[PDB]
Amino acid sequence: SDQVTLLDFWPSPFGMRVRLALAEKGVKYEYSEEDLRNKSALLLQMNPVNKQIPVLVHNGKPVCESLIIVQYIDEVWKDSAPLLPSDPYQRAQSRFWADFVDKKIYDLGRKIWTKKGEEQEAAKKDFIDSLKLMEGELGDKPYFGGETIGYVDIALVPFYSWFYAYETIGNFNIEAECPKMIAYCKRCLQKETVSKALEDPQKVYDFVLMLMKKFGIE
């Protein structure tokens, strides 16, 4: 009976998080591709402050910010396995590592393709170091969520679709430095929800090339 619309833009790893969370919890929804150059009345109505995607509109009410949206989904749709742990301590740990993806993985990945020379080299090193910290957190578990896809998996795994772009522009190989991280991503990709939610790495790379041309930083 519920009305669910996702305002999104295809190459966004932030949008991919929400696509994955909706799929993982079996939520039926309408996907709406936004033109971010000419933002729709709906996007402006629903996210007046940030004017960004993704935005989830559920029964006429908007939820903004990808990680906030994933938590909302977890709290609202309950007829599947939880994405966040029920134990408060474990839940706080999951929040810590999901945030870490925003603060380190996204930020440093962005520096890899937007910067050059020594600054870019530093970003690559810090990016790899950050993935290594996540490998440590994963430990011997198959997923960050344990035996199923959890909040941290949803936060992180969409960035795999950007790895080829980071590697090609930055000139490095993540599998060589972080084989456990890559094994983990490939394991996640065996799942239909993950493979359907994540975009093609070649297409994402071509999108980043378009941005580099736009900003004159090839």
- Structure-block tokens of residue 160: 């795999």
Contact between 162 and ligand GSH (CB under 6 A)? Answer: no
53 assigned binding-site residue: yes
Span from 6-14, 65-73, 193-201, 206-214 in contact with a copy of itself (CB under 8 A): 65-73
CB 25 within 8 A of CB 73: yes
Considering only residues 4, 5, 9, 95, which one is a binding residue for ligand GSH as defined by CB under 6 A?
9
Task: Write out the DSSP string of 184-204.
Answer: HHHHHTTSHHHHHHSPPHHHH
Q: Does residue 46 sit in helix, strand or coil?
A: helix
130 assigned binding-site residue: no
Contact between 24 and ligand GSH (CB under 6 A)? Answer: no
Q: State the nearest-atom distance from the C-beta of 26 to a copy of itself, in Å.
A: 17
Separation of alpha carbons 161 and 99, rounded Å: 19
Q: What does the buried/exposed string (b/e) look like for 44-55 if buried means 16 or more CB atoms within 10 Å of the residue's CB?
A: eebbeeeebbbb
Contact between 199 and ligand GSH (CB under 6 A)? Answer: no
Residue 142 has φ and ψ, to the nearest 5°, of: -75, -30
Q: State the nearest-atom distance from the C-beta of 203 to a copy of itself, in Å.
A: 30
Contact between 131 and a copy of itself (CB under 8 A)? Answer: no
Q: State the nearest-atom distance from the C-beta of 40 to ligand GSH, in Å.
A: 12
Note the residues at the interface with a copy of itself (CB under 8 A): 49, 58, 61, 63-65, 68-69, 71-72, 75-76, 88-89, 91-92, 95-96, 99-100, 133
